[PDB]
Design a protein around this ligand. Structure first.
Ligand SMILES: Nc1ncnc2c1ncn2[C@@H]1O[C@H](COP(=O)(O)OP(=O)(O)NP(=O)(O)O)[C@@H](O)[C@H]1O
Ligand SMILES: [Mg+2]
Length: 446
């Protein structure tokens, strides 16, 4: 990474991993950064060599030596001029290094959260709330798995008073592993979504591992309106509990959905407040109520929580409203599924001007799915539907909808829509692998 980092001593590296220095060659200078990318390691870094499926970064140690790196963390001694901390397993050692740094920072109050949807948005909301009060570390991008979580904890500094760790795992045992490294004071689940083997039951059990390592006198956060609310409350029973959602501790009433925001009355065990939330859509109201519950569990005042929500900003590709007078471009390109795709159309339906929904394929599904999506969206009063990809033909089945196999062929059509019409409102969305944000940037170019 590239943020300011607190250095490591050779002694700290060894103590965290219980490794040994090869041939007793011990670095006499401090280590400024631990990284896994052989392209970027330089003088002062420690290169930690990971292996995985058909890959082994031990193969690239000569590259980091040629580039000036003089410290490596490895599973086996390499014949090279570099100090080497030898460990049994470098994936485990990375976990231990993150766990050690988390433990050394005893001043921290720590949140861990998971869920099928809304993790990143809820994390950003908490980040806004907590960063107003003190230095706060939150998960960057998708660093939320067995490697990403400890990589994030390496960025902890003595100045940090708060940490908000997103945990992304979906499979049995994975959340136990990362949440044990994190050692949260407050943790919980936002929702259980649709089936990925194991079924939704398996997803529930996996994410319920997040309650196992909550620290003494901590708090478990539970969703009060989930299909698995009762099972999740049982999983959290060894901890003090707070809930969010209708019928729960923290909930919203008189919700008003505006074109780029949402108004509602917020209710909590610490009092109530109106909230002018600068996020669009009912799902983001739900994410706000979860952030409120997490923040109250850390003792933040309701007043500071509302101030944090009202100035919070969304992650990239999550309903970003981009004004390009006299046109609007909504960037919702981060990902897609059949449910969220229909939800996005509802947001576009609230905008002024000629409404054009540009959509790419939805993965992990498929033909019948797009057939019904193209049918349902065509019944909506959208002005134009531009379907791009391998299943655009399916959506065409069931004037309003045009289908393109490639983006290259879709770009002139979108350009022609400008000419054919008067302000336009575009919304762009597709699964991550379709990266519809290039087609959006390409239309915006001119
Ligand atoms: N609470 C929610 N319930 C249902 N869908 C939601 C919710 N919040 C967001 N979404 C949808 O999920 C998309 C991604 O939201 P995001 O906050 O990035 O979730 P995430 O849980 O971090 N995803 P991921 O890290 O890829 O597993 C949004 O663009 C919405 O379409
Ligand atoms: Mg995420």
């Amino acid at each position: 990474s590239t943020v300011p980092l607190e250095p490591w001593t050779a002694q700290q590296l060894q103590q965290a991993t219980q490794g040994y220095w090869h041939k007793d060659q011990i670095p006499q200078t401090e280590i400024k950064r631990i990284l896994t990318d052989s392209r970027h390691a330089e003088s002062g870094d420690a290169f930690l060599a990971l292996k995985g499926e058909r890959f082994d970064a031990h193969n690239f140690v000569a590259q980091v030596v040629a580039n000036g790196c003089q410290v490596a963390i490895v599973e086996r001694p390499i014949d090279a001029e570099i100090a080497q901390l030898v460990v049994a397993d470098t994936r485990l050692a990375l976990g231990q290094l993150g766990a050690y740094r988390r433990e050394q920072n005893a001043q921290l109050k720590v949140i861990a959260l998971t869920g099928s949807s809304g993790k990143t948005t809820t994390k950003e909301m908490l980040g806004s709330i907590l960063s107003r009060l003190a230095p706060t570390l939150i998960t960057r991008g998708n660093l939320n798995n067995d490697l990403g979580v400890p990589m994030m904890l390496l960025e902890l500094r003595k100045e940090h008073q708060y940490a908000v760790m997103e945990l992304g795992a979906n499979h049995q045992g994975e959340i136990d592993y990362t949440s044990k490294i994190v050692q949260p004071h407050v943790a919980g689940i936002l929702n259980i979504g649709t089936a990925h083997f194991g079924g939704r039951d398996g997803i529930c059990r996996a994410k319920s591992e997040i309650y196992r390592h909550i620290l003494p006198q901590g708090v478990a956060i539970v969703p009060q309106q989930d299909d698995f609310t009762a099972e999740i409350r049982e999983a959290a029973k060894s901890h003090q509990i707070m809930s969010f959602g209708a019928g729960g501790d923290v909930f919203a009433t008189e919700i008003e959905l505006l074109p780029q925001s949402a108004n509602f009355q917020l209710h909590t065990p610490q009092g109530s407040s109106f909230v002018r939330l600068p996020f669009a859509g009912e799902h983001n109201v739900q994410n706000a109520t979860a952030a409120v519950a997490f923040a109250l569990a850390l003792g933040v005042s309701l007043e500071d929580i509302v101030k944090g929500l009202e100035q919070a900003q969304g992650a990239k590709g999550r309903l970003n409203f981009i004004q390009k007078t006299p046109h609007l471009f909504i960037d919702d390109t981060y990902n897609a599924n059949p449910t969220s795709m229909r939800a996005a159309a509802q947001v576009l339906l609230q905008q002024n001007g000629i409404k054009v929904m540009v959509m790419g394929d939805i993965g992990e599904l498929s033909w019948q799915e797009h057939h019904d999506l193209g049918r349902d969206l065509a019944e909506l009063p959208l002005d134009h539907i531009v379907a791009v990809g391998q299943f655009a033909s399916a959506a065409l089945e069931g004037t309003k909808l045009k289908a393109f196999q490639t983006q290259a062929e879709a770009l002139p059509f979108l350009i022609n829509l400008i000419q054919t019409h008067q302000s336009m409102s575009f919304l762009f969305k597709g699964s991550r692998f379709t990266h519809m944000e290039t087609l959006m940037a390409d239309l915006m170019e001119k």
